[PDB]
Design a protein around this ligand. Structure first.
Ligand SMILES: Nc1ncnc2c1ncn2[C@@H]1O[C@H](COP(=O)(O)OP(=O)(O)CP(=O)(O)O)[C@@H](O)[C@H]1O
Ligand SMILES: Nc1ncnc2c1ncn2[C@@H]1O[C@H](COP(=O)(O)OP(=O)(O)CP(=O)(O)O)[C@@H](O)[C@H]1O
Ligand SMILES: Nc1ncnc2c1ncn2[C@@H]1O[C@H](COP(=O)(O)OP(=O)(O)CP(=O)(O)O)[C@@H](O)[C@H]1O
Ligand SMILES: Nc1ncnc2c1ncn2[C@@H]1O[C@H](COP(=O)(O)OP(=O)(O)CP(=O)(O)O)[C@@H](O)[C@H]1O
Lengths: 288, 285, 286, 283
């Protein structure tokens, strides 16, 4: 039911599946023509045994979006797929340190909750670097006219040298040649990261992603905190209509907090663009 | 919808938040509700509470509301998990349901597989399994009589309590079809052919699902269509593919399964018929 | 001893390895034994198997051996876990015993406490009478044990198993000893009688003290003894005469029974025969 | 009772117990005198509610042994202890990657998983551990319970020998005398200890051999398929584990040297370090 795409097709016999991280770790022999005989560790996304029709179409769409998005340092990259005779396997780059939320919580400074890595406590500069890298990834994404729609710390992967990689393009959409994407009435986007236009007007643009980026920044500087703490989603709707905004994370410069607030401007066009975010973050990073 | 939306007040079902103490997670958490039974106003009763998570989407809230509404109009029955109330006003939505002491059927069954099969628990007798099937048929028969389609019938969605009592659960995808129901969110391996190929869902679609449930029961929690990816199932069902008979399952019960998997909905038995047959098979067992 | 050592043959208790199929751990694992009951040769019966682990020590082996031997020597009784057989020849030592489908008493009691900590079974909520019945059944088990001149030394709710029919069965004879003709520290401190340490002696009266602690666990529905008090401080406290408070909703009559059990002087504590008699009356009146 | 030792005593109010890893994670403010108000994550060892007299005597012994071993990069170090007015707390260094056995089983090749050990990484692990033992032996201390499960891995793949509950000081004595039926896992026990109840640094060398086998099998279980009760006889008959797949004959021969029936004929930890350093370099 899925026509072949020779450019990305990967031979199943060259793929050995491992334990799940549904995404499972795996070994792909020569998924990089450069090193024909070299086996490399990769992550494989597949369907669960109880998958729905929508899960299959979501995995396909996700695979195709990654093809069109292109390659960037701060984006988890697609390496191939097994789409013929057999279960659909979307093969992507493996990120050894998991998602950013867990990554940060694990290396929070002592004083003030699972595995811990003190030799990696986050310095303020590390946090700013994380934010700058992510702004760079989004800037590239937007330049490719793609909206992510599900940007959050849980959807950012961290690889070897604390390199941030945007991931999880299951809800991403291409808005080339259209002014904005039209969300369904009751979408599948986590509400706490949703821009107001999306939530109330069902409209989605790059500036909507900028809003999400603001919540992500708050996650970063709270070292993995959960947005709008103590506020259930059902009560958030009203609060947002009344302009509610999260306060400054402890141990965060007023400058960075103001950046978050700019990201949460009620007027989309009045929020910075990812291009401006990168420019400002680069400066802030440079200083520090 | 969900965002600029506000849950109305429903007296007979509302339950005070100060009277509910959320417990440990079973999103569903265990909990204690004082007076949920208006006949024992001082009695703290243990119950299960379904609520939204922090990362909830608009559709999650929409589904929880729908689930709650479906349960209100389904009425009591011993083989169906029933609604005890809800905290809808001023605060997060809490759907209070009855607590099942033994967990979901799928795991309940895998726990008691024979040593060397595929914390352990005492094996199940054939009579026990037949009984489980019977009760489930009785639960669905009542559900169909209330003109409700469950659509997500599976072992993972049946709760076990007391003395091997079966209680149909999770009405998150259930629909009221009084006065059929036109990318599905239903697990493919439990889906009737017409559900996709024709975008239609009736009680006869639920009967197909019941068949798969029976297979799960007699394979002691096995995964349907083992080794076959969901993406290939489409074709196979079309060619007439059907699951093999579970080991140690009477031919009589397996034929019941096959009847349930008739391509044409009108050629599958009705839950009334299944209840009658199963009632006899249980007696003879 | 364990290393350069070989287990003697005992045809009476020996069970064929080829007729035992090991299951998953409950090390004790569930298993199916065909013909363990020589009267139903073709019947496969669910049993529990105690065996050594990969990282077992020499002491683990000798302890397993003595545990098995103690059970052979104690003899049958309704309130004591039953030894069904053993695979001692040519291969790992497997001590086969009766399977108790409801688990250990501590967890059993905790799962059915009344409202107001894992799985709950409200439909089997403990009534005052059930607790008395449990204490009684256990009194009878220990009375029988004493009559066989065997001290348990490790009596505790975690070492009591409850069958599907809610029958109390004394278990874990890993530390049990035969004192036929006292026994001059691997015993959990909070269940230990004063003379056990301070005097290095152990008699049936030591087991009676433990029984008292067990009673307390029963009536607090699986509570932890001396809550908030570390084992290292217990020593001193018992010396000053410290004793646990009465469990909530426990009759004073039963609490006095507990205190009698905790008499500093062993000879001043009741005997299991006396406990059985008293408990038999209290049960009937309840 | 337990007389105070000001040198190691740490105030209880400065320690905040955390989730368990019995051993729990914790935060100790100023556990480093050089870092006054600086809080640091550590691991606290304590007794369980059902502890025996022996459990307590062992925890005390564990602490005292650590108080005399001294510090070394490849040994989990003692930081302090709360011994007065309250439960006994042995405060030790926190290892961020858990124990070596699981650390390795998770690093196994496909066919929660983790990347993967290169042969060089395994050799480095082995070398670091030989270094830790060499220091231990130089301190005239026998570990007696050396195994992958008792090695902790921290931050940057640094091996730290841990669990000194069975460790003993043999300064001024030719060998330690084991109890008849000891509490030492048999599969890691040198024959002299098992059959003759004698224990020397060379007995630890034997255990090191089994440890090597664990490392190169990426966390495999020694004498696979052989129950402890059958191992006794096999060892009397000179049984020895075969070469782990994907292991150089050179490293396997090192293991075999470690399992020489004659203690003095086994390499010393000093020789092991020397040889491993060379092998590591050529790798
Ligand atoms: N490519 C990838 N590399 C590493 N971890 C990944 C991954 N994709 C998903 N995961 C993790 O596995 C599981 C997800 O919740 C996420 O934490
Ligand atoms: N009402 C209920 N009672 C008990 N367990 C429930 C429940 N609803 C959901 N669960 C559990 O939560 C999860 C399911 O797999 C099941 O085990
Ligand atoms: N014959 C039997 N039938 C059923 N369950 C049994 C059993 N023998 C033991 N068990 C259960 O299996 C559990 C695990 O066995 P094991 O003997 O290893 O524990 P243990 O007694 O050493 C631990 P503790 O007493 O500290 O909880 C026991 O705690 C008990 O609950
Ligand atoms: N200091 C320490 N740091 C981290 N983990 C430890 C530790 N001491 C013990 N552990 C681990 O916790 C559990 C043990 O089996 C061991 O793996």
């Amino acid at each position: 039911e899925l026509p072949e795409d020779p450019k990305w097709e990967f031979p199943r016999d060259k793929l050995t599946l491992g334990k799940p991280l549904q995404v499972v770790m795996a070994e792909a022999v020569g998924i990089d023509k450069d090193k024909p005989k070299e086996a490399v560790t990769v992550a494989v996304k597949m369907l669960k045994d109880d998958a729905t029709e929508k899960d299959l179409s979501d995995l396909v769409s996700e695979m195709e979006m990654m093809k069109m998005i292109g390659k960037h340092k701060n984006i988890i990259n697609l390496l191939g797929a097994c789409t013929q005779d057999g279960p659909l396997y979307v093969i992507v780059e493996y990120a050894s340190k998991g998602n950013l939320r867990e990554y940060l919580r694990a290396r929070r400074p002592p004083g003030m909750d699972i595995n811990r890595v003190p030799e990696e406590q986050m310095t303020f500069k590390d946090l700013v670097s994380c934010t700058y890298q992510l702004a760079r990834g989004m800037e590239y994404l937007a330049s490719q006219k793609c909206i992510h729609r599900d940007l959050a710390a849980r959807n950012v992967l961290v690889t070897e040298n604390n390199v941030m990689k945007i991931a999880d393009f299951g809800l991403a959409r291409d808005i080339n040649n259209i002014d904005y994407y039209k969300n369904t009435t009751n979408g599948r986007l986590p509400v706490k990261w949703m821009a107001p236009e999306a939530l109330f007007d069902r409209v989605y643009t790059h500036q909507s992603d900028v809003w999400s980026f603001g919540v992500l920044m708050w996650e970063i500087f709270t070292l993995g905190g959960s947005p709008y703490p103590g506020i259930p989603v059902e009560e958030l709707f009203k609060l947002l209509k009344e302009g509610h905004r999260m306060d400054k994370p402890a141990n965060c410069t007023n400058e960075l907090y103001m950046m978050m607030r700019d990201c949460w401007h009620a007027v989309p066009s009045q929020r910075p663009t990812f291009k401006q975010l990168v420019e400002d973050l680069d400066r802030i990073l440079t200083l520090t």
